[PDB]
Design a protein around this ligand. Structure first.
Ligand code: PQQ
Ligand code: PQQ
Ligand code: CA
Ligand code: CA
Lengths: 72, 573, 573, 71
């Protein structure tokens, strides 16, 4: 693996000698919980929702409020 | 922001961390020069009131200095006509649990500023460790608005400084050591309203690409790679945070910055090129759409986080004057690109001892890897240069346009590295490697170098006892200024590298110096307060040489010279 | 210690917090003087690594500076030929709970030193907040012995500097706000073996009285008074701790120091003169037995803790040269006594606004009280001068023998005071009074004054924005140096009080300046790091004006000028 | 109470107008708990006793040890 042999433009990864092409079902299967993987994006949507609630409130009233439970 | 740009041309001001949109860190002020700098003395000082690492540096806009602080990120404004009195202050209430999800000390790289204002009054911007981007009145300190960007529950914080472009403020991201998937966000300065948000990995719409993405360099790779260079949903926790610096070309109307390392450090757990981690970005300002993107380190095996600063300049490439960006990466290579097309102009080793790559093929753009210095499961790679701290880290460097030289503070640190298998859980560290660090082959930990970025020609090179971490400041007085980890500020002649002045500060320096003129006299200012990654051993009282992600052993002797501190020093003739 | 005395008399050394056994705080060095102090600049600095208040000042012996620190009381040694490197360090492990039983910030007033002699290597002595006295190897920082003096479980801590006399080191006490009965202890420096211990209240055997106690002034009182001036067993928890400074006359072989306030602050709970709280002691060095004892403030009602410095001088009293001690008490009176007989020579108001006392009757030695400014249950007393912080506090002041003048940093604070009933519980606070403080009748919070201690003649007086808390240093260059709470070091002409120099330190100052000659050059050094009683508001972030034992209100504005810090500053030409 | 009228040398305390000679059994009785009053004295006895073991050990063995359970 010298990084030179590319299967496509921008894609030149190869396994090292003695290592699998796919890690799924192998020695080094990362075995990730899908539920844990999805928590980041779920958290960001929550923030963007609270953020939009703060913006629209700031726009209508003209006074900024951070605490969304204090927003009508 | 044209008015911000105009304000930066006033030598009374220092309006952003990078000094100006090209991040030159160069002052035309010549009152202080190689001829009289020996007479430089402390004029006045301020305590920040906290300890730990003090990165970034003050801002100066309208004869008013603005000071920031590591966690809990306190902010103070000072009238330069009354340096003893605090004009206003802002003291954030943050969940102290944020401390626990910071890999490398609770550093913060500082404030941003925007003048008035159809949006309206002038504003100071602060990223808090807890993930908030906050807007303050530049004159009164009143909180104007405050938004949630990053969630510490997910191991996601902020450390990189906000960045003002037009009527928008860009906020980066941090926590690739905790498997945080990178993203940069643009907020409307008036509202705090999210305009656009671009991720470092995943589907093309999340990357926020332009239809002509890399049309000038299609061999860089174009579409689908945010998915296809990963196995399965690996990209959802695949790093690529950006906690470094930006650059901006108003003519091209483009933002430049680099994305960070993939997660985890265990390369065997994420086969593939891992795009678009470790990528130099050129995004359109209004839409956030990438016009080009170049991956420096495909399938990272060393944590060479691609977040270092972006230095713009205009120099000749084969007789043709060309808009450029120069960018010294953690991987020990200095990249220069055409900042319009993204075309690779040069990529040279900042120090010949770099050994993870034999060379970069400028035609293919690919770094030719030396398998002898790779990392992999069930193997302990030895003698890798650079280490994960890189031959260059978060310091902003400087450019003299008349000499056409970039002046940089360099690290000389190498490592041993062995990965291990580990699970991912939201909120937990997700590193997966054991490191040991030590000086490079030349025996020293630090260097200071002057170089032409197009040719790679080193004009001079000097050693430093410890890695030079905080960046540099260059002036038309033929001087370059910088702080050292063992607690000095130093001035060298930019023609020769000769040491011409040094002062013993209370604590080590991990930020950059600034300069400005107030009431007709030139001043030099700097933060003193050691910390950051080189100081984790000192700061958190660590003993194990592999603790602090391997940094502890390398910087064991640092505590022989400096304790923690927190102050602003100001010098003048 | 005759060797320690000799060392104190050449200007390459600063061997004790008080400089010498007479606490002159006066230097013969003249390189720096009133005519060139204009050009004084910062030579080098050190960070202490901690925040909170920095009282006392470094020591300099045989080319080594010795640095100390608030909780956890870290010690550092620095070679003056290599000011960046730390020669050695001692980092105490203490119970964090010790913080909780300190009344007025976790301050510490410094190291003591003994030369090598028969005991034998040279030693550094440290009093820890947690009530330990520690002996350290002066050259290596190795721990030689360690003893328990005070128990934090009882609210008993240590904040005053150790004091070396002959082959003994004296350790005081602290915690009268927590009902601690005061006592001073002498430890053998070879062994750490307790030689003697004297209490401030109770039976005469516990007080350690000489058979000829107060023979020269029996009207002061003599025997039995440690019990009969209390009701029942109230003496068992009756204050009198000594956390201030000592003085020593080798020719008379006598130690001088003042015991502190009675407990509780609620005067109604402890009827009687409360002897021997508030007392100027003159004790025999070897046996600890008192030759004389003068109670300055019988039945204290104001917390005028009588622990301030003793300054020894020799001046003419009615034409005859007399051995004296001069002593600016918290009660706003400046006491001058014959330091052999204990006879009262004069006792004048340090500022004419003092109202709790009409005047001291010199022939009877009694302070004639003004009932209008007393305190008592079910009454809120208004407009008492001085307040409990006193018109003078823990600062060590200075004496120019040529000019026969003392130079003092003065407080101008006054108070409201109402007591309330409260139980005693070991380990709990035992104060029992609510206070509110404000500036005195003259609008200022602070003063600097030069005075003749025998006549009482004021030579000059200048205002200061805040109380001058850290003490002074005078030199044969006609200069007096001091630090201010808002964060300056200042120099004034000793003949006139004219301001000659001023430098803005990072943080406020609550300790004294020192000066010493190293390698033919004169230096000035000082701690910068605000705290102590005046700083409790900003240090612990308090808002209620009566909190911090009534300090928070009067010093609300302090935070407008200074944050916490921790550093050493060294000046030179 | 002006501090000038004295029962005996060094003893000049007087109650203030409306206040008692003794506070015992009065409105201002401190009502101290004897056991609490004794805690300082006992604590000090223990410290002196531990210190003594440290000194006797140090004199005997020539090597200092703080923790008394190791002595
Ligand atoms: O992946 C990340 O999100 C992330 C964040 C940070 C940070 O927040 O400072 C650093 C790094 N990585 C990193 O790799 C690194 O070497 C580093 C050094 C420092 C510092 O304080 O100087 N921060 C960081
Ligand atoms: O009686 C005591 O036990 C005691 C202790 C201390 C101390 O520990 O510093 C102070 C006082 N009293 C006191 O009355 C006082 O005004 C004071 C000021 C300070 C300071 O550090 O600024 N400590 C103390
Ligand atoms: Ca990283
Ligand atoms: Ca007290």
């Amino acid at each position: 693996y010298d990084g030179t042999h590319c299967k496509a433009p921008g894609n030149c990864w190869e396994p090292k000698p003695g290592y699998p092409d796919k890690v799924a079902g192998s020695k080094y299967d990362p075995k990730h919980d899908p539920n844990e993987l999805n928590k980041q994006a779920e958290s960001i949507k929550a923030m963007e929702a609270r953020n939009q609630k703060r913006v629209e409130n700031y726009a209508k009233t003209g006074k900024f409020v951070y605490k969304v439970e204090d927003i009508k | 922001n044209s008015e911000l740009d105009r304000l930066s041309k006033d030598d009374r001001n220092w309006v952003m961390q990078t000094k100006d949109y090209s991040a030159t860190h160069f002052s035309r002020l010549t009152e202080i020069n190689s001829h009289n700098v020996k007479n430089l003395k402390v004029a006045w000082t301020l305590s920040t009131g906290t300890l730990h690492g003090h990165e970034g540096a003050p801002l100066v806009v309208d004869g008013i200095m603005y000071i920031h602080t590591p966690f809990p990120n306190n902010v103070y404004a000072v009238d330069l006509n009354d340096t003893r009195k605090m004009l206003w202050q802002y003291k954030p209430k943050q969940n102290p649990a944020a401390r626990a999800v910071a890999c490398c000390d609770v550093v913060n790289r500082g404030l941003a500023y925007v003048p008035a204002g159809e949006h309206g009054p002038a504003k100071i911007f602060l990223n808090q460790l807890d993930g908030h981007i906050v807007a303050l009145n530049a004159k009164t300190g009143e909180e104007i608005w405050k938004m949630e960007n990053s969630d510490i529950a997910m191991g996601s914080t902020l450390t990189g400084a906000p960045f003002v472009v037009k009527d928008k403020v860009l906020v980066g991201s941090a926590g690739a050591e905790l498997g945080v998937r990178g993203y940069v966000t643009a907020y409307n300065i008036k509202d705090g309203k999210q305009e656009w948000r671009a991720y470092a990995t995943g589907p093309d719409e999340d990357l926020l690409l332009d239809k002509d993405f890399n049309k000038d360099n299609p061999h860089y790779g174009q579409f689908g790679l945010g998915l296809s260079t990963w196995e399965g949903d690996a990209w959802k926790i695949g790093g690529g945070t950006n906690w470094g610096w930006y650059a901006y070309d108003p003519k091209l109307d483009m933002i430049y910055y680099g994305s960070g390392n993939p997660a985890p450090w265990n390369e065997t757990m994420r086969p593939g090129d891992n795009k678009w981690t470790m990528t130099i970005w050129g995004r359109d300002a209004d839409t956030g759409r990438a016009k080009f993107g170049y991956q420096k380190t495909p399938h990272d095996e060393w944590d060479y986080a691609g977040v270092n600063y972006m230095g713009l300049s205009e120099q000749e490439v084969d007789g043709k004057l060309t808009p450029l960006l120069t960018h010294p990466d953690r991987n020990g290579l200095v990249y220069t690109l055409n900042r319009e097309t993204g075309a690779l102009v040069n990529a040279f080793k900042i120090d010949d001892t770099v050994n993870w790559v034999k060379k970069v093929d400028l035609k293919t753009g690919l770094p030719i890897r030396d398998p002898e210095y790779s990392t992999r499961m069930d193997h302990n790679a030895k003698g890798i240069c650079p280490s994960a701290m890189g031959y260059h880290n978060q310091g902003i460097e400087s450019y003299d346009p008349d000499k056409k030289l970039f002046f940089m503070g360099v690290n000389h640190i190498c490592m041993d590295w062995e990965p291990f298998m580990l699970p991912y859980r939201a909120g937990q560290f997700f590193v997966g490697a054991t490191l040991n660090m030590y000086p490079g082959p030349k025996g020293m930990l630090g260097q200071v170098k002057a170089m032409n970025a197009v040719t790679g020609k080193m004009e001079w090179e000097v050693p430093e006892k410890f890695a030079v971490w905080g960046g540099t400041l260059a002036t038309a007085g033929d001087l370059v200024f910088y702080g050292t980890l063992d607690g000095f500020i130093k001035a060298r002649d930019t023609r020769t590298g000769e040491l011409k002045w040094q002062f013993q500060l209370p604590s080590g320096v991990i930020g950059h110096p600034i300069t400005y003129q107030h009431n007709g006299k030139q001043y030099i200012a700097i933060y003193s307060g050691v910390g950051g990654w080189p100081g984790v051993g000192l700061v958190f009282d660590l003993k194990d040489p592999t603790a602090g992600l391997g940094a502890v052993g390398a910087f064991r002797e640092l505590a022989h010279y400096t304790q923690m501190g927190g102050s602003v020093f100001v010098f003048s003739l």
